[PDB]
Write a protein that binds this DNA or RNA. Structure first.
Ligand SMILES: [K+]
Ligand SMILES: [K+]
Ligand SMILES: [K+]
Ligand SMILES: [K+]
Ligand SMILES: [K+]
Ligand SMILES: [K+]
Ligand SMILES: [K+]
Ligand SMILES: [K+]
Ligand SMILES: [K+]
Ligand SMILES: [K+]
Ligand SMILES: [K+]
Ligand SMILES: [K+]
Ligand SMILES: [K+]
Ligand SMILES: [K+]
Ligand SMILES: [K+]
Ligand SMILES: [K+]
Ligand SMILES: [K+]
Ligand SMILES: [K+]
Ligand SMILES: [K+]
Ligand SMILES: [K+]
Ligand SMILES: [K+]
Ligand SMILES: [K+]
Ligand SMILES: [K+]
Ligand SMILES: [Mg+2]
Ligand SMILES: [Mg+2]
Ligand SMILES: [Mg+2]
Ligand SMILES: [Mg+2]
Ligand SMILES: [Mg+2]
Ligand SMILES: [Mg+2]
Ligand SMILES: [Mg+2]
Ligand SMILES: [Mg+2]
Ligand SMILES: [Mg+2]
Ligand SMILES: [Mg+2]
Ligand SMILES: [Mg+2]
Ligand SMILES: [Mg+2]
Ligand SMILES: [Mg+2]
Ligand SMILES: [Mg+2]
Ligand SMILES: [Mg+2]
Ligand SMILES: [Mg+2]
Ligand SMILES: [Mg+2]
Ligand SMILES: [Mg+2]
Ligand SMILES: [Mg+2]
Ligand SMILES: [Mg+2]
Ligand SMILES: [Mg+2]
Ligand SMILES: [Mg+2]
Ligand SMILES: [Mg+2]
Ligand SMILES: [Mg+2]
Ligand SMILES: [Mg+2]
Ligand SMILES: [Mg+2]
Ligand SMILES: [Mg+2]
Ligand SMILES: [Mg+2]
Ligand SMILES: [Mg+2]
Ligand SMILES: [Mg+2]
Ligand SMILES: [Mg+2]
Ligand SMILES: [Mg+2]
Ligand SMILES: [Mg+2]
Ligand SMILES: [Mg+2]
Ligand SMILES: [Mg+2]
Ligand SMILES: [Mg+2]
Ligand SMILES: [Mg+2]
Ligand SMILES: [Mg+2]
Ligand SMILES: [Mg+2]
Ligand SMILES: [Mg+2]
Ligand SMILES: [Mg+2]
Ligand SMILES: [Mg+2]
Ligand SMILES: [Mg+2]
Ligand SMILES: [Mg+2]
Ligand SMILES: [Mg+2]
Ligand SMILES: [Mg+2]
Ligand SMILES: [Mg+2]
Ligand SMILES: [Mg+2]
Ligand SMILES: [Mg+2]
Ligand SMILES: [Mg+2]
Ligand SMILES: [Mg+2]
Ligand SMILES: [Mg+2]
Ligand SMILES: [Mg+2]
Ligand SMILES: [Mg+2]
Ligand SMILES: [Mg+2]
Ligand SMILES: [Mg+2]
Ligand SMILES: [Mg+2]
Ligand SMILES: [Mg+2]
Ligand SMILES: [Mg+2]
Ligand SMILES: [Zn+2]
Lengths: 37, 98, 52
RNA sequence: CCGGGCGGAAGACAUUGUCAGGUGGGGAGUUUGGCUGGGGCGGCACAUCUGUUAAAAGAUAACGCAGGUGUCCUAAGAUGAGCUCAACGAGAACAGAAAUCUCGUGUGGAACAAAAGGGUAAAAGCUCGUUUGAUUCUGAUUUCCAGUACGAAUACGAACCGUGAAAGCGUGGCCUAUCGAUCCUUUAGCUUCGGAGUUUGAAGCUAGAGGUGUCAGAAAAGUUACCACAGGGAUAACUGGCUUGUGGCAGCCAAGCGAUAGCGACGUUGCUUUUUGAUCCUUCGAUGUCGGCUCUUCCUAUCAUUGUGAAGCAGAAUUCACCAAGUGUUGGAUUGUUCACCCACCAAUAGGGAACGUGAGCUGGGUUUAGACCGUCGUGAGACAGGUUAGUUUUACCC
RNA sequence: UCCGACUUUGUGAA
RNA sequence: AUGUGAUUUCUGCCCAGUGCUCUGAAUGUCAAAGUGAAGAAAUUCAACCAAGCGCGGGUAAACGGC
RNA sequence: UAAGCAGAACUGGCGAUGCGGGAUGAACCGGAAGCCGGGUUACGGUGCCCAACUGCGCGCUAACCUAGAACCCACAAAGGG
RNA sequence: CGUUCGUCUGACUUGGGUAUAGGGGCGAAAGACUAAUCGAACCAUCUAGUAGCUGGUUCCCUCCGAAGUUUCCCUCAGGAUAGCUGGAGCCCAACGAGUUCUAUCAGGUAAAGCCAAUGAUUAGAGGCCUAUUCUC
RNA sequence: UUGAAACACGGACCAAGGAGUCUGACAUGCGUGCGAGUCGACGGGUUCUGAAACCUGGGAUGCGCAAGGAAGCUGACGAGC
């Protein structure tokens, strides 16, 4: 899902639903928060 | 467009084939019956696998409709149907001008 | 598309764990009457390395 | 010793099976208009009206010119009666350029929902009175035209009405645009459900509405530089051909400058095809697309050199012009360049053509495949005519 | 894949 | 399961958007089954109504903006 | 601006068509056609190429610019002597 | 293939055995590799797949002989439709005609006009008006 | 193809092979039989050359002889110019 583009970039949020199908569930799975506190 | 509510017009009913007084109301499409054959045929066709089986019209172009006036004879109590030209605003028995 | 790498690990083909030089499962002795009611003495004979 | 519970944990919850609702580019299938001085972007010339092009019957094209349409109106529809509009002249306290009244003139110079063109004066305009004919039933004809449909219109017939004393007029709007099939749904006014009935439901017949604006009417988003096929020279990107606006070069006049030494405004006539456009005739079962290196010929619109004429030519130098293409026109810094711009030498460092000469002669720095960065753009895949770096140059023995 | 109904699914107390 | 890419040094502001997430309000929407009321019945009507959606909060070393 | 450009009206033509002339050429001029003999013409020509006069007659031109020389047609201007 | 070049005690080189198979594998990631085949291998079959598109389409003479235009169509390199053409006839012989003449209707193009309406437009003259005036 | 000798494609040569066919449904035309009828097509009988041929089944098999109407249902009273 992160592949492609003319620059290396995800292009959509890397946080993904808990119920996403396999193959779609990549990145940060069911994250309550992101970033460094 | 403004139309009165007590038009005198020809009634074709066999009781009085002449000019009688009519009440004027606006026609509205009746409630769709779930038992209509085309509806029963459509529901049988939609069941199962295959997705949408009939064309679903999208490209609307008209911004008006032909208003249909129901005319009720005050002797027979039978009805007549009459469509008028396309109008954006319509009312029956509004306030007269002047 | 094609099957992603995260999906291919569940088939366990080349993603099975490397266990050829492991010394066996590490776990307590099976619970029995002596342990349930008293004590049993064992002696430590080796302290060994387990790969992985 | 006795208990016919292997020992725990959870427990009618979870789990299984079947239905129902949500989510679901993880995956499947499909689509992703047309016209078009290539295509795309733009526009709409796709239904549709007026004037003109249009060549005094009709018909008539272009992405021709100037505009318009998807509405609006119970009156702005019908009819009867009465009246006359724009504007001007002269008048009357407040009151003047425009407030209200009066007389005279007034062929429409006004108004008639709208664009434009027609048309209309005891009206088709304005004011008032009564009204709903903007009604029912089908036929016929006109315009479009295949002489099919639709829309729109006209002339009758058979009713029922309105208004007028009446003849008459009225089947919407003074005329020319103002709109929509089959299937399905819904509505308005007897037939069937086939063993017979009662009786809900359903299906029919006649006539409207719900809509297709790509308007004789599929239900529909992108990208490909990883790409494929069938074909196009019906169709772009080299060359060549026509043209010469633009580019370049040359003239005529003579107001001025300093009239015609040398120049020359305002005008005006040409030539050329080393510019760029315009076109799309040739080539898409392929004519190897930039530049330079090398090599030969050709032109003259002559830069130098030969011989001359002119000067606001004392000399020296320079400028203008003529006959003249015989001989020359170079070495370098930056840049892939072409073009450019500087250094230097020189008599001088003129301009061009030959498929923008020349890749089975080379080279491959640039353009322009596939890898990969950046900036901007895009949700994305990807794009960029922006920059950057790496990227196979085949064959001659035939005439 | 989540979610509800039925089925698996029984027994007794307030 | 992802992003960045040794060390040094530092990583500002932004939770409106799109995502992700929450133990939060509860009724705004809201399926099948089940419930009730009419009807001779087919059927119709009505209330109830799961998750999700909506409402509210968190989150940028999430996508991203400045 | 123009174009061997792009688009209309009437008619003809080429496309679908040979044959004679325009040296050559889809369309221009003549003319349309079975296989032949004889006669005569169209357009166009009569110095040679090339069949047919170096025919009869009047002027104009002299090009030391390649003088000039056949509709379409294969160009030339303003201005000068 | 030659010369030149990178690495060489490690994320090193290599044999055999074994595992993973096509919308699948495997990938220190180039859409790379998967038997000279990869942006979805190869084999047989469905299958003589479809094609408005390109190419070809075989004897002679004789007679007749076109169209590139109308309308509609997701129509624009295609169809149907009318027109143009052939064949088959059949019915008959006064009827006609891409022509003139006689008569009679209709037209707003060329030209002209502005010293006529609408519009544009130069100049004076005599008292805003009047009579002229150049040019559309 | 508007236009080909084309610097537009195919073609080195020769031999053999090589492309509007068969079937179904309609239609016009023509030919043959019968004619308000016609068809013997599936079966049966028979057949000493026979997968021919010959005979036979229709008082209702198919098309015709009668429309119109959604249907319920009705159904041509006999022409002049
Ligand atoms: K990406
Ligand atoms: K279905
Ligand atoms: K897959
Ligand atoms: K349970
Ligand atoms: K589902
Ligand atoms: K999906
Ligand atoms: K259409
Ligand atoms: K020029
Ligand atoms: K080509
Ligand atoms: K390299
Ligand atoms: K990150
Ligand atoms: K935000
Ligand atoms: K947010
Ligand atoms: K190394
Ligand atoms: K080595
Ligand atoms: K090994
Ligand atoms: K495959
Ligand atoms: K086509
Ligand atoms: K005139
Ligand atoms: K005038
Ligand atoms: K050839
Ligand atoms: K019969
Ligand atoms: K009927
Ligand atoms: Mg993906
Ligand atoms: Mg289902
Ligand atoms: Mg479901
Ligand atoms: Mg898909
Ligand atoms: Mg197109
Ligand atoms: Mg273009
Ligand atoms: Mg466009
Ligand atoms: Mg006219
Ligand atoms: Mg005419
Ligand atoms: Mg006319
Ligand atoms: Mg008008
Ligand atoms: Mg009318
Ligand atoms: Mg009356
Ligand atoms: Mg009126
Ligand atoms: Mg009228
Ligand atoms: Mg309808
Ligand atoms: Mg159409
Ligand atoms: Mg061409
Ligand atoms: Mg110029
Ligand atoms: Mg000048
Ligand atoms: Mg070629
Ligand atoms: Mg060549
Ligand atoms: Mg070649
Ligand atoms: Mg010279
Ligand atoms: Mg020279
Ligand atoms: Mg050149
Ligand atoms: Mg070249
Ligand atoms: Mg080469
Ligand atoms: Mg080269
Ligand atoms: Mg060469
Ligand atoms: Mg290169
Ligand atoms: Mg590249
Ligand atoms: Mg972005
Ligand atoms: Mg490079
Ligand atoms: Mg890391
Ligand atoms: Mg927030
Ligand atoms: Mg809820
Ligand atoms: Mg429910
Ligand atoms: Mg042809
Ligand atoms: Mg030809
Ligand atoms: Mg002869
Ligand atoms: Mg002589
Ligand atoms: Mg010639
Ligand atoms: Mg002269
Ligand atoms: Mg080597
Ligand atoms: Mg697998
Ligand atoms: Mg590897
Ligand atoms: Mg790539
Ligand atoms: Mg195969
Ligand atoms: Mg269509
Ligand atoms: Mg073709
Ligand atoms: Mg006129
Ligand atoms: Mg004129
Ligand atoms: Mg061509
Ligand atoms: Mg040929
Ligand atoms: Mg050629
Ligand atoms: Mg070809
Ligand atoms: Mg060949
Ligand atoms: Mg043969
Ligand atoms: Zn009545």
């Amino acid at each position: 899902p992160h592949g492609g583009g003319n620059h290396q970039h995800i292009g959509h949020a890397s946080t993904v639903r808990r119920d996403a199908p396999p193959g779609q569930k990549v990145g940060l799975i069911a994250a309550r928060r992101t970033g460094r506190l | 467009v403004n139309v009165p509510k007590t038009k005198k017009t020809y009634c074709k009913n066999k009781e009085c084939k002449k000019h009688t007084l009519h009440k004027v109301t606006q026609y509205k499409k009746g409630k769709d019956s779930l038992s209509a054959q085309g509806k029963r045929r459509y529901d049988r066709k939609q069941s199962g696998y295959g997705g949408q089986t009939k064309p679903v019209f999208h490209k609307k172009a008209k911004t008006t409709k032909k208003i249909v006036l129901k005319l009720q004879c005050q002797s027979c109590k039978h009805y007549s149907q009459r469509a008028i030209k396309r109008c954006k605003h319509f009312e029956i028995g509004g306030d007269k001008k002047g | 598309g094609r099957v992603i790498r995260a999906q291919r690990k569940g088939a366990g083909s080349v993603f099975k764990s490397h266990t050829h030089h492991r010394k066996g499962p590490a776990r307590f002795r099976s619970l029995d009457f002596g342990e349930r009611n008293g004590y049993l003495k064992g002696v430590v004979t080796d302290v060994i390395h387990d790969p992985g």
